[PDB]
Design a binder for this molecule. Sequence first.
Ligand SMILES: NC(=O)c1ccc[n+]([C@@H]2O[C@H](COP(=O)([O-])OP(=O)(O)OC[C@H]3O[C@@H](n4cnc5c(N)ncnc54)[C@H](O)[C@@H]3O)[C@@H](O)[C@H]2O)c1
Ligand SMILES: NC(=O)c1ccc[n+]([C@@H]2O[C@H](COP(=O)([O-])OP(=O)(O)OC[C@H]3O[C@@H](n4cnc5c(N)ncnc54)[C@H](O)[C@@H]3O)[C@@H](O)[C@H]2O)c1
Ligand SMILES: O=c1[nH]cnc2c1ncn2[C@@H]1O[C@H](CO)[C@@H](O)[C@H]1O
Ligand SMILES: O=c1[nH]cnc2c1ncn2[C@@H]1O[C@H](CO)[C@@H](O)[C@H]1O
Lengths: 411, 411
Amino acid sequence: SNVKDMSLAPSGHLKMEWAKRHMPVLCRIAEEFKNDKPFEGLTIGMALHLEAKTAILAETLLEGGAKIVITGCNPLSTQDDVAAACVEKGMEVYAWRGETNEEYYENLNKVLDSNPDIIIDDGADLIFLIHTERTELIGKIMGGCEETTTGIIRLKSMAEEGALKFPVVNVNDAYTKHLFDNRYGTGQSAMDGIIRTTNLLIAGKNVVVGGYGWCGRGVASRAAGHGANVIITEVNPIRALEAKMDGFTVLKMEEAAKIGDIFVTTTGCKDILRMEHFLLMKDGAVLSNAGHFDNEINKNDLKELSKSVKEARFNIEEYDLGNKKIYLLGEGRLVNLACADGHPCEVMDMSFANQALSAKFIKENKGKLENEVYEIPYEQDFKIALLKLHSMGADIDELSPEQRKYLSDWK
Amino acid sequence: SNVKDMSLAPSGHLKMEWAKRHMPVLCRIAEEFKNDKPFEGLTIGMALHLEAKTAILAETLLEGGAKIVITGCNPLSTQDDVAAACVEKGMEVYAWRGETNEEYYENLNKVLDSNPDIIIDDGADLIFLIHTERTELIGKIMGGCEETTTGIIRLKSMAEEGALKFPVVNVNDAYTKHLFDNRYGTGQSAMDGIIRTTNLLIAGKNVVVGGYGWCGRGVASRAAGHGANVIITEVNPIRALEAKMDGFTVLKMEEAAKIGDIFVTTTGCKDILRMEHFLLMKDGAVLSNAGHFDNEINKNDLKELSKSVKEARFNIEEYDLGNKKIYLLGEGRLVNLACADGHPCEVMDMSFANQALSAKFIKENKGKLENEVYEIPYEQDFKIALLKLHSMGADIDELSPEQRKYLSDWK
Ligand SMILES: NC(=O)c1ccc[n+]([C@@H]2O[C@H](COP(=O)([O-])OP(=O)(O)OC[C@H]3O[C@@H](n4cnc5c(N)ncnc54)[C@H](O)[C@@H]3O)[C@@H](O)[C@H]2O)c1
Ligand SMILES: NC(=O)c1ccc[n+]([C@@H]2O[C@H](COP(=O)([O-])OP(=O)(O)OC[C@H]3O[C@@H](n4cnc5c(N)ncnc54)[C@H](O)[C@@H]3O)[C@@H](O)[C@H]2O)c1
Ligand SMILES: O=c1[nH]cnc2c1ncn2[C@@H]1O[C@H](CO)[C@@H](O)[C@H]1O
Ligand SMILES: O=c1[nH]cnc2c1ncn2[C@@H]1O[C@H](CO)[C@@H](O)[C@H]1O
């Protein structure tokens, strides 16, 4: 087991203590998993953003009988104290903050070295690595679960070509996931990363958000909530029109780059900000990324234009272009996880609840599932949404029998 | 042709002149229909909310070669001057404001008496009456178009039972329809109806919104925009959770009836507010409805509790319950259409663009379509949204081919 500093373990345990007390839906699932022990004898290899709430998810599976081998899905998002606390919990952990690309793929491989039965992934890199380099593990793998939009794109494009070799559950596209995780979760946590790292006033700034899907909406909403003038970029006209009618300025990036004070890319696509955009930017512009991979902002292009790169502050790099400066947060990686604590607890409670139950779904269908992407059933979303609603002290009306009849027969 | 007063026509012509200048997407389609004359020789029977913007759609179809027989789909939403101007334009009009239930169904039948080829309806009343009482018309009918959520519910359950006898295009569920007409359109137009009729200050009121679908969100956001304390009612926990995280109080209607100052029902279901809720309401509570039919508020219950019903102000009825008064706007009909001029022009431009092209789709697919509910293809939404985006002074970026390879390859 390979972690940064085992002496950091107490601080991580405390953070797990705090998180466990604020994830009620997962806490209930855990008690049911403590009995019925669904994962006894199985190995679950996990590649997630290793902080307190992931550690609780891993703990939920461990107490359910599973052996847990886990690594980080991002070189910068791991929290060393939490990882050390995970080893004290009895987990095989290969993760630290700041690992090289070379080291990143070493830790992924070591997780696969444990011969897992279930794969839990965030971005499909663990799943990808199996199909390309480690085909010798496909036999034992019962199935997987994928957390994020970008991972689903790859998995679906794999499945489309017929390259997918074991079932994978689409956890991202569940109603209680992408509607809350991607929107309200990154809405708060991305602004958290920016505010905590920069100590800059959001109000009165031009905040340029690339893309207006679920993540864009969230960031636009919370940035607008803090008094920003929000500008939206898109390639989808239906979604740009939403942004316009939500009160935002819609521009081609070649234009938004001229006036933006803070940039947040949320597209899942590469090269949102490249050479031509950097040359248009104002002195002092601050750059950040909330989409999975670090290639939305072209760092090689930015290094190419620069005469030097200095530390401007913790998690802020200064690129002196000679005539102006541009700041990059968290090396252009997930600004909410590279520069903050990730999504708030109550939102990750729902996402990891779907994750937990999806692993149980994989187990119970050991050999009966197709080599396809499976969608999460609506009742699971209904159950989780209702539990979360109640924990916040709200409730729902219920249709009377007469009302159900009016809505189903046409009289 | 049967209308209230032909002398009112000049006001109708002016209102149509004004709308035509603010419906650019439909204005383009009309010129193509004037050119290609797709409906030459055909009769189109239409049941829509007969105001200035519906008249433009009818005229657009008239210039496309069609004979137009139109009535209102609601007894109160018709504008008499617009109807008069419609007859001066050469349309067969059977509609006036405030028509009785027998008059409403007499006018519905008169439209069908013209033996139409294409049916354009809002709420499935024409399509329903055809299938039940006027079955001899199925032969000549090529197809239909349905405007609203409620109409689609009926049409889908009809088709599910095998009772649908000609194809109907689902105009409501188009992206450029329910995402903007039901949300932004209803958001502004319903609050206009409430504000315009009552002259009451929205800020500081407890506004109880029934339902949190597309119409619910719009009303809630616009009510909040004006400083109301928004309370949401729902039977869908996923959507109730949305409202909670958008900053609203979520309650069962029994608790909400105790504190609500203004009520807006947006459910499409009957009996949202009944006897038991009227007994809980505050003295002076204002009741309003934005769902298609007037049975979301149980008016029979309210009369039974009332010692008298009198005019309190134009479009306001005072129901004196003896110990308190309850006010009802627009006889519990579409508060944005019974008490105002309906959706804003820019929003109906998109909805009526889809209506026009779907009528063209029906004609060109004569005898080829099944007796099923047809969805509007994505390329139609794309074209419409892009056109609408451009007219509002914004534009969209485009992916380079290299960016298009990245989003499709799983490496
Ligand atoms: N904690 C986090 O930081 C977090 C959480 C959830 C998802 N994500 C990642 O964020 C990304 C999107 O999340 P989603 O759920 O919003 O996906 P989504 O697809 O709803 O949002 C994507 C939007 O980007 C737009 N887009 C694509 N290329 C563009 C371009 N070149 N210029 C402008 N706009 C463009 C698309 O039209 C789409 O609207 C994914 O990579 C996902 O993994 C991150
Ligand atoms: N101009 C207008 O006024 C206008 C425009 C569009 C649609 N509409 C009408 O408004 C209604 C809604 O349209 P939509 O597109 O919102 O449909 P939608 O179904 O998305 O919204 C309906 C919501 O009502 C909720 N609901 C149902 N019964 C309920 C109950 N008893 N208590 C609480 N919540 C309940 C459902 O869960 C759903 O979320 C439909 O009747 C539609 O025809 C009116
Ligand atoms: O605090 C967190 N812990 C674990 N996963 C997280 C956290 N915040 C966000 N994500 C998840 O990371 C993915 C993007 O790579 C998203 O799927 C999001 O849900
Ligand atoms: O001003 C208007 N003219 C015509 N139709 C309208 C207007 N406002 C709303 N609707 C339409 O009425 C239906 C609800 O019964 C909805 O489909 C909405 O699009």
